[PDB]
Symmetry: D3
Subunit: 295 residues, 6 copies
């Protein structure tokens, strides 16, 4: 019922292994978005001119990773210098409606926060329609450098390390964490503790601004996509604490701790990756339409 | 030049090994006090009726418990039911004048506080007539239970454990420490840290009163025997800090830290154990007379 | 079908937050006992004169399942609670306040709720290194054990009072082990660090405390389903804890075998209304009423 | 025999405690340099107008952070708005010739590298006129992040931490170390290991250039002041190794190790801080003149 | 329907506790094999002359290693100097067909590799008819002696110690591990690391040949029984790495690591312990017949 | 005034670096023995045919520097000669000794005394609680980290592949070092850098036989006395059991050595004479007497 053009794409297992990884995954995500959109809206056809025109089919085989549920719907087609994909309508008999690429709903089991799949998210929204030492560590005022904490990573605490850039690290890794906690029992995340060793590695004091980064944490947490089922639709309840990290003499850095309360309904990390084809192009459906269509 | 009576004493190696150790050491200390007293003054004779009357001579303790320098000066005598000791005058030819039983002057080298001998104390008084991480630990406010400190025992810090009784433990062990520090570079002593492991244990909060124990520390520290050679003649400079020791939730106990500044002259732990015969009686000479006689 | 008087009670969220916690939880627990008792036997009404008589409603610690059954009423200086009969439709019969049935999953001993206890009794009607640590005899002070807390071993610390600590914390442990795979509990090991901190030798009598644990363990409420009805099989070992070649204290270890049926810590907190007052039904009546 | 002007200086214990610390120690170092120069050359007088002119003497304080040996030579004087210091000639009878401010000759005894004082440097130059696990750690190729090394800090190994700036940290902290090793048994210094815990941290890989920093280490070590007593006056024998520091997937940083051989004679960190008065101004004597003047 | 002779066996709880354990477990295994065979084929009787012919007569007990499911089928009989066991045909009402003594199918949950029971193996084969730090540890090259690894034992890594004999230790313990991994998510096993402490010990270099042991593990890994249900029937995918273990100076030993991929179907450690009586002799059915009869 | 023949020697710095190290040190130690003997007895000359006969002079090697001041090298055709002056008594040490074999423990290292240290030592001889606790323990756990640190009184040493050879080789140094300085304890099976317990496998040790072996090795130790009463060295051996999980895995082999009145050697001191035939190392009596 729809054409969709990926454009210039390189086909072939060996050829894609030997191609610039960034462009490889760019092309791949274009194909995955197109297949998701065609799946969710009706039947469709994808087209893309082959870049390496001296490499022909039967040198490609299965390649450029195709999700297994999606693979059952598409069908490969090769015509002259162009490549086509026949996308059947998304089956509704696999108890889950509308093909979603990534739920962006995270939840933490034992020691791992993990993004829910289609089924896990389905049962999750279905469910939502109807420790002491950790608190002590959060209440602490002054950590020592290379201090080994005795609080172990669990469903309520997550030790994560800083990257080279503090702001980018917390802005990138925080949404996953606060989503996972809010959706499952809540808990604490500590930035600057090394998970495998549970030692305190504060980020250098010269490489952090506390008030500015706190405003950044507030912005990032408020910008989180939220969907409610209840009457009194509240906000995410978080509290930020900067723990001081000294070593010998005087202050060295900070460990950046965020406590996230369990959340009544459901919270996303980013707008869920699911796609429509509206009028003329692939357009990812927004949060309301996604969670309502999942119902 | 003097009689001196030890009284009822049990003689014999086997017989004293098989006797109540407390009474054994009582008798022994009486004999040593008598031998010191006779030694520093004119020669003398000690007498004591043997308790174990089935004792034969030459079955004694060659040095029952007598410093070797003393053994060379005395001479044993056995007559009927009594035992006598011929005490020659203390030889001034050893370079040491008074013949002291224990200097009670302590000093800390590397990892050990140690009481100076006669020679070491002599050269010490002769000399007196002519770290950052430790400070950080002292300035700290809140220790965690079983925290392993990275500050190691040294010439400036001494980790000592509490006994069952806090007041008796600190009142008994503190004078040695503050003397040793005052005489050599000063330093810190911490009560409630286990030396071999450098972990924080601390005395239980229910078994300590802070203001009362601090008054006790001040009283005990003022009471230390001090001798000056200098002009102004100052007092010992100490600072007491009670470090809180929490575990999980909330406060569990305290670590009792004392910082002791290096001292101008010399500081004793107790009045030096050296003995005179004045009005034909054993009488330990006081601190002033001791340090003056040492010259 | 029954009157019941709580008496002098202070009402109000802010006012109870600003009230002595001891008396607050006394009052609260009286209300919980009364609502449980009326809940189990018919319908009833609770009345209690308000203490802070200048504070009225909209100017408490109540379980959510109970909340659906009661209805608050304010009349002059007295406060009333309308207690409906316990709804047998939540697959669980008779409202129980606390099962006092413990079981240890993974690293935590936990008291079973009404449902968990129900399914548990229904099921009951139809490691090597740990044993090595128990068989030992001489631990060193601040020795870090390599045996980790699990469904079979529980490291618990001593309190300031040894007798009170073991006498208070032991029933929970032996119940939890008896109900799930059994296991060992060690007193004097610090759980978060797995180090040995024996209680001081001057503050413990071994034979007397052994008699005390024996009494506490035998007096534990037990209910049987089988033909032969034996007692709980426990073994006590006092591990010596030395430091610098000198006995310092003891670590007090108790091994508890897995138990055929069910073992309680205390008589289960569930309440009746008899012609006189609220009266907690005994163990037999509770375990029979659950079925 | 000489005037010397410190200029605008703030006098007073309380007043200097309440003054900008940087300007405080700038002024202080001017006074110390002047007193050193006057001491070494002959007799002299220092003058400086007081800044806080309402804070006069008996507040100016005996405290000015001045080495005690120097205090015995100077004598303070207060006149109107100016302050003077009478500097006697340096007393040679304390077995040490010429007043030195800082020898800049380092040596590592047991667990501490330390700058020698006048006496220690004297006896040191006088003496100069007449481990396996450490080598294993140096030969290693890839340490793991937060690895606890079993090699302990000793007279032969020194664990030092990185600062925020790697280049500045090694360029500032290395001369002390290589001097201390060169003067006493030699040894290894490791950058990126935490001394109190003997754990491996290392500077982040994004904040270091390997070849450029190696050239920087070569320049800094060659630039070191050296004085010889022997026949064949050789150079410092050093070797630099970058240990890789991985964590989980892949490398995070490097630990920067320098091995320094024991040195025949003496090696400095910087030109020794000792001062002359050359006709019109204070002028710190160079290395040659200092080490030669120390011998007499 | 069948006789079966165990032969000379000692009966009696006290008497077997007081008998040579080797012969005791030999006899016991003969009885278990016979009862398994009679169970699997059709009702039969076991016979065995008592060794201690004056010690048996209701002074035996229910004691003796007999699985309870089996015991519900047996019936003991005592006649003069001989002992008989009446074995009913295997129930089959327990949802599980054929009495199996040991599945020899292993699977690793959490921290334990474990042999599946009859039911677990049944549901497992039924299901089969229809980490980063670990990989980092495997990719390494040079471990230090007594190094504490931060990778913890999990469903994917198994730390096992060497015995006194390296070849016998790995040849005996490897099949269990590779089976358990092949049946559940796969994973790594490390030989020479102490599980309770996660330290590196490794077998001494003088007590190992790398190429010979690599051929040995390859042989042992190929020799293990495998059964397939799928179309293409591949082999188990394993990779062996010898990690060098130095201490101070130079090489001390090796840690022997094996990575085992998750396997399509089911993998055994040995031919499954289940027994038939063919003709008139006890004969353990082979792997194919066992897995097929399980249905 | 004595000839001495080293024999076939391969000469040359590059050539000796490129030669079999075993034969290298064989030859070298022969030269050192000859130089020691000639030094101690009088003047002498050493002769040795060069092996690599195309590698001559203009193409120094392993000799103590004090010896170097006495020797003088000479190259003549296919033979090489060494002029050995009589050992100068003008240095503080009489006689030239190659190795005192008298050990003493300073701090964390046991060390063989040099000529001067041994001289002052014998001259001087002519006129802790946690360690004792560890010795008494009898039962260690595998990979237990001991809190007793290596010091002048305790020495942690590891086992080799062969237990008997390891203890028989490393024990004399230790017991000598302790006997000469404060005494102390040595533990076999503890890893020094980590202070963990690594017991030797139980299958690879016989307790009574090895105890007889250590007794023999300790009695065979060279001893020299200065005092009136001349007793033997007082040692006590304890085998500490090392369990892991389940049951016994191995043993840690502990030896306590009391401080000794006089001096104790590890082996007969390496010092050499020239008798009418060859180099002949003087025995212990002659060495310690000659030092006086
Ligand atoms: Zn909501
Ligand atoms: Zn004074
Ligand atoms: Zn029962
Ligand atoms: Zn030179
Ligand atoms: Zn397969
Ligand atoms: Zn002797």
């Amino acid at each position: 019922e729809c054409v969709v053009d990926a454009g210039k794409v390189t086909l072939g297992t060996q050829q894609r292994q030997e191609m610039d990884p960034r462009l490889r995954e760019k092309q791949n995500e274009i194909i995955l978005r197109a297949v998701c959109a065609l799946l969710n809206s009706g039947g469709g056809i994808i087209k893309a001119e082959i870049e390496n025109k001296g490499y022909n089919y039967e040198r490609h085989g299965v390649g450029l990773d195709v999700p297994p549920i999606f693979r059952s719907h598409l069908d490969k087609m090769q015509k002259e210098n162009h490549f086509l994909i026949f996308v059947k309508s998304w089956n509704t008999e696999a108890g889950v409606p509308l093909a979603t690429l990534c739920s962006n709903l995270y939840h933490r089991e034992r020691t791992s926060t993990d993004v829910m799949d289609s089924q896990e998210a389905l049962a999750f929204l279905k469910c939502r329609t109807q420790n002491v030492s950790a608190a002590a560590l959060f209440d602490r005022k002054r950590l020592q450098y290379l201090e080994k904490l005795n609080l172990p990573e669990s469903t309520h605490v997550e030790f994560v390390m800083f990257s080279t850039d503090v702001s980018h690290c917390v802005k990138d890794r925080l949404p996953k964490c606060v989503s996972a906690f809010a959706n499952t029992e809540g808990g604490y995340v500590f930035f600057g503790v090394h998970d495998e060793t549970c030692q305190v590695i504060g980020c250098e004091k010269e490489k952090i601004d506390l008030t500015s980064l706190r405003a950044s944490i507030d912005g990032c947490i408020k910008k989180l996509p939220v969907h409610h089922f209840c009457t009194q639709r509240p906000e995410i309840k978080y509290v930020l604490n900067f723990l001081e990290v000294h070593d010998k003499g005087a202050l060295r850095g900070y460990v950046c701790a965020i406590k996230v309360e369990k959340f009544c309904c459901a919270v996303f990390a980013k707008v869920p990756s699911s796609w429509q084809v509206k009028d003329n192009r692939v357009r990812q459906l927004p949060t309301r339409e996604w969670t309502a269509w999942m119902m």
